[PDB]
């Protein structure tokens, strides 16, 4: 789970 | 199982703030990212914005900039949004919402707040060309959407959604990644899509089906909604 984004 | 809490229903005076909760139980409260949503009657489901409570990364729909502030607090596991400078247009119900790998699986009950009386253009459009659709119990339904532009990822998964709103409930996820049912959603449900163009089925409509069914993208900020197909039963 990517802290920036929640775009995958 | 997950609870999304929501806090109480504001009334407020146009010009002042108000600031909601979403205390969250059940799950990893700093692993997820939290989105909230606004349902104004007569406009559907809007995407406000995201925050990951670990990291404190919030990503905000250019509209709601300046209108909208989220923070997380991780020892009381709960996020907030802030609505500043109220007017007719704020008045709305408003819900939180669990990210799991870009399903919106769980949602709180919603806050409702009511007040007294040129841009987003690279916004992907989500158009659902019939506002509602009639059908006899027992028979079987399709209902329509389109987006502007391809939800294909380079990743190959397409990155459409459906939801039902039941009356008096919150939205409830359906179909993720434009073909999966969602746990518990029986296999009269079905997706599919072809280019930018979504359908969703009914094999058999029931009772139990009744409500709005939207169409989502989460391929890319701002996420973006169709404006729903309300599903009634037709009387003989
Ligand atoms: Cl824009």
Redesign the interface.
């Given at each position: 789970?990517n802290?920036?984004?929640?775009?995958? | 199982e997950v609870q999304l809490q929501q806090s109480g229903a504001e009334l407020v005076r146009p010009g002042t703030s108000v600031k909601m909760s979403c205390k969250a139980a059940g799950y990893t409260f700093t692993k997820y990212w939290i989105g909230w949503v606004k349902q104004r009657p007569g406009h559907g489901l809007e995407w406000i914005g995201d925050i990951h409570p670990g990291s404190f990364y919030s990503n905000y729909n250019e509209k709601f900039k300046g209108k909208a502030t989220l923070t997380a607090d991780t020892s009381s596991s709960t996020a907030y949004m802030q609505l500043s400078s109220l007017t007719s247009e704020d008045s709305a119900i408003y819900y939180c919402a669990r990210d799991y790998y870009t399903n919106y699986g769980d949602w709180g009950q919603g806050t409702s707040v009511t007040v007294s009386s040129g841009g987003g253009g690279s916004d992907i459009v989500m158009t659902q060309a019939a506002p509602s659709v009639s059908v006899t119990p027992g028979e079987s339904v399709s209902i329509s959407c389109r987006s502007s532009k391809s939800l294909l990822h380079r990743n190959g998964n397409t990155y459409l959604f459906w939801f039902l709103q039941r009356p008096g409930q919150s939205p409830q996820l359906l179909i993720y990644r434009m073909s999966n049912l969602a746990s518990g959603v029986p296999d009269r449900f079905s997706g599919s899509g072809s280019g930018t163009a979504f359908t969703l089925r009914i094999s058999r409509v029931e009772a139990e089906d009744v409500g709005v069914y939207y169409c989502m993208q989460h391929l890319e900020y701002p996420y973006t909604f169709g404006s729903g197909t309300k599903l009634e039963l037709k009387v003989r």
């Open positions: 789970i802290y920036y984004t929640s775009e995958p | -």
